[PDB]
């Protein structure tokens, strides 16, 4: 016989689209790659247990091509599957409230996410893909599966993959409004004609090489091309935060001196991030785990500091 239920496809889960689907044929046969709340259903045949429901689909047509662009800000042919494949595990994670931040209960090596995520609920960033806008907001409200799958999709990391906090933040920064952000640097050797540079946007809020912000304020000897070693020093900073990164190295975090940091313990192959946040005292957040002390020595990779406006006084 002939049987057909009605369902809606969507790329953004806001704009729906009426379809009537033949209950013999798989969704793969009708819409192509299709997903139900993360589940690949391309090869399942429609249950009447599905009438009224929203499947995500690959952006096959132009209507879809434009909704997906406007919501996500990408045209990566693969973005959508990546986002559903990741959502299909993120939906099953636990996002506990830990000291009033949303964290993630450790699974599938999401250590780097929990710390990235905890960093966000802590610094002033505004996302440009409405997708992130929307998903972040639920995440703050402690509903974070979507935000997580979204980060996975924007980073081309699949659930399980080993990820790096720095690179992760590079990706989210790319999709965040930091135009007004402005860094001016100068690098002086003792006998050179000391060259200066100006950095704008993301390039202005990330530095790789030292954890210490005040250190960078005072000068950092760098592998320069002079006759001696040259000091790199920060001339001017315009931004709502800065991020200092560097390879994992034993470092001490002092209450009241930073906003937060990332500890990486292990090696390239095997290791674990943790997040330290400066509040009434030092709190160390490790997924669902919480500990406290007053001072913290340990192998740090990333330290973030609140900022707005800084002129150096060094001549
Ligand atoms: C709302 C809004 C907005 C503006 N916008 C648009 N469009 C395209 C058509 C649809 C319409 N929504 C406007 N696409 C965008 C952005 C945007 O801000 N960022 C973040 C970004 N990206 C980069 C590369 C940055 C670089 C430096 C500083 C900040 C930056 N911020 C993006 O990544 N993409 C892809």
Structural account:
- The protein has 7 helices and 19 strands.
- With 315 residues, it is of the alpha+beta class.
- It has 3 domains: 4-57, Ubiquitin-like (UB roll), CATH 3.10.20; 58-181, Orthogonal Bundle (Helicase, Ruva Protein, domain 3); 182-308, no CATH class.
- The strands form 4 sheets. It has a 7-stranded mixed sheet with strand order 10-13-18-14-15-16-17.
- Helix 2 (79-90) crosses helix 5.
- The longest helix has 12 residues, at 79-90.
- The protein is elongated.
- The structure holds ligand 356.
- Ligand 356 binds at residues 70, 73, 128, 174-179, 201-202.
Instruction: Sum up the overall morphology in one term.
Output: elongated
Estimated structural class: alpha+beta
Beta-strand percent range: 25-35%
Largest sheet: 7 strands, mixed
Bound molecules: ligand 356
Protein name: Papain-like protease nsp3
LRR repeats: 117-139
Subunit structure: May form homohexamers. Interacts with N protein.
Active site: 111, 272, 286
What is this entry, summarized?
The protein is an alpha+beta fold and 315 residues long. It has helices spanning 62-72, 79-90, 111-120, 130-140, 145-155, 165-174, 213-218; strands at residues 4-10, 17-22, 34-36, 39-40, 54-57, 97-98, 101-102, 182-188, 195-200, 206-208, 220-222, 230-238, 241-254, 260-266, 271-278, 282-286, 289-293, 295-306, 309-311.
List strands and helices in order, with pairings.
Blueprint: E1 4-10, E2 17-22, E3 34-36, E4 39-40, E5 54-57, H1 62-72, H2 79-90, E6 97-98, E7 101-102, H3 111-120, H4 130-140, H5 145-155, H6 165-174, E8 182-188, E9 195-200, E10 206-208, H7 213-218, E11 220-222, E12 230-238, E13 241-254, E14 260-266, E15 271-278, E16 282-286, E17 289-293, E18 295-306, E19 309-311
Parallel strand pairs: 1-5, 10-13
Antiparallel strand pairs: 1-2, 3-4, 3-5, 6-7, 8-9, 8-12, 11-12, 12-19, 13-18, 14-15, 14-18, 15-16, 16-17
């Amino acid at each position: 016989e002939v049987r057909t239920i009605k369902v809606f496809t969507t790329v953004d889960n806001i704009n729906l689209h009426t379809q009537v689907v033949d209950m013999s044929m798989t969704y793969g046969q009708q819409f192509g790659p299709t997903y139900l709340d993360g589940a690949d259903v391309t090869k399942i045949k429609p249950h009447n247990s599905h009438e009224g429901k929203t499947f995500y689909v690959l952006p096959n047509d132009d209507t879809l091509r434009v909704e997906a662009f406007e919501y996500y800000h990408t045209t990566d042919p693969s973005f959508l599957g990546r986002y559903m494949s990741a959502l299909n595990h993120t939906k099953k994670w636990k996002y506990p409230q830990v000291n009033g931040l949303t964290s993630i209960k450790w699974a599938d090596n999401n250590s780097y996410l929990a710390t990235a995520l905890l960093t966000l609920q802590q610094i002033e960033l505004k996302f440009n893909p409405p997708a992130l806008q929307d998903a972040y907001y639920r995440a703050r409200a402690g509903e974070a599966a979507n935000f997580c799958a979204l980060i996975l999709a924007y980073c081309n990391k699949t659930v399980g993959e080993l990820g790096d906090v720095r690179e992760t933040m590079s990706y989210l920064f790319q999709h965040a409004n930091l135009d007004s952000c402005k860094r001016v640097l100068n690098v002086v050797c003792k006998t050179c004609g000391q060259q200066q540079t100006t950095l704008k946007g993301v390039e202005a809020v990330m530095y790789m090489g030292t954890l210490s912000y005040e250190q960078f304020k005072k000068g950092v000897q760098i592998p320069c091309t002079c006759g001696k070693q040259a000091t790199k020093y920060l001339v001017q900073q315009e931004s709502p935060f800065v991020m200092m990164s560097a390879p994992p190295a034993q470092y001490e975090l002092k209450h009241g001196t930073f906003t937060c940091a990332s500890e990486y313990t292990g090696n390239y192959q095997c290791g674990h991030y943790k997040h330290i946040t400066s509040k009434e005292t030092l709190y160390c957040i490790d997924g669902a785990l919480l500990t406290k002390s007053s001072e913290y020595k340990g192998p740090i990779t990333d330290v973030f500091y609140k900022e707005n406006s800084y002129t150096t006084t060094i001549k």
